[PDB]
Amino acid sequence: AKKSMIAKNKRPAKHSTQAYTRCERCGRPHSVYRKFHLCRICFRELAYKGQIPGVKKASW
Amino acid sequence: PRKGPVAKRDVLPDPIYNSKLVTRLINRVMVDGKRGIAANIIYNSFDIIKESTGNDPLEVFEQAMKNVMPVLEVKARRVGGSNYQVPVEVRPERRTTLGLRWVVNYARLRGEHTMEERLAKEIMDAANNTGASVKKREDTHKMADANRAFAHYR
């Protein structure tokens, strides 16, 4: 039962406190970045793909 | 540790008393670097000595270095697993370590109902032959040459 919850959030919400977001290529409800609209692990992997603008590895 | 030796980081003297080992006595009660409470009430306790049976704090600090002084020390050096040690000749580094650890961790053991009268009576004891830290020097004299039954095959 995964394809109901992909088309679920594209509706306008029933009330104001159900506006939760997730990833778009995948469907992780936990640990989505609101400034990205990507989930956790796809940011890491697509960052290793060399396609996300900006982001570099970190060492200091 | 395993590779070789290591430094010891000797302490600087006070800019008030001008004595190095007084700083070593400061830096064993002081918790979280709180010099404001603990070191100042140590100042207050040695001034209590100065006001009652005392003249100068440096001389009575040397008098405490007399009557607490660890003359010997043992260290458990097993060979085959058993309780094996010997009264070793103490370094004046480790002499000061043992003696001031006796004084400070007996000021822990004392626990009198004023936060510096425990220190005042602690250094009135450690400076004037009394208190159980001087009796810890007595008991250190005791086990010196009392574990010697297994310390003469060396």
Binding site: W60 | L12, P13, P15, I16, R35, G36
Partner: protein, 128 residues
């Protein structure tokens, strides 16, 4: 007018010293020796290079430093006297250097690693 310029960097606090010939004071944030500082304003801590150069002196200090506690930015005081004596006396510089007095501490806050609690404090290894 006569005034000096000596900078000093310890514990993330630059310290510009406007040293003027006086009697030996401080106006730290234009405040005196204990209008800003508690009793930990000790003699051999602050007034160390006066015992090797301009003995006993001293001259009055103007400075503006923030960063660190009372003992941190007081460590920036020695760099001010170091750069002041650097400005003033070339022949006492060797007596400064053999007594040290100019070796800047390169220490900052240590980098705190993930996977642990702190920079070095590993977690409680609760084996069993």
């Amino acid at each position: 007018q006569v005034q000096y310029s000596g900078t000093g960097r310890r514990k993330n606090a630059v310290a510009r010293v406007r040293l003027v010939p006086g009697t030996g004071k401080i106006t730290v944030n234009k405040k005196d020796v204990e209008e800003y500082i508690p009793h930990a304003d000790l003699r051999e801590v602050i007034n160390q290079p006066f015992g090797v150069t301009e003995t006993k002196g001293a001259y009055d200090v103007i400075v503006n430093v923030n960063g660190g506690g009372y003992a941190g930015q007081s460590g920036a005081i020695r760099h001010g006297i170091a750069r002041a004596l650097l400005q003033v006396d070339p022949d006492f510089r060797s007596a400064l250097k053999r007594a040290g007095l100019l070796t800047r501490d390169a220490r900052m806050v240590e980098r705190k690693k993930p996977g642990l609690k702190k920079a070095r404090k590993a977690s409680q290894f609760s084996k069993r």
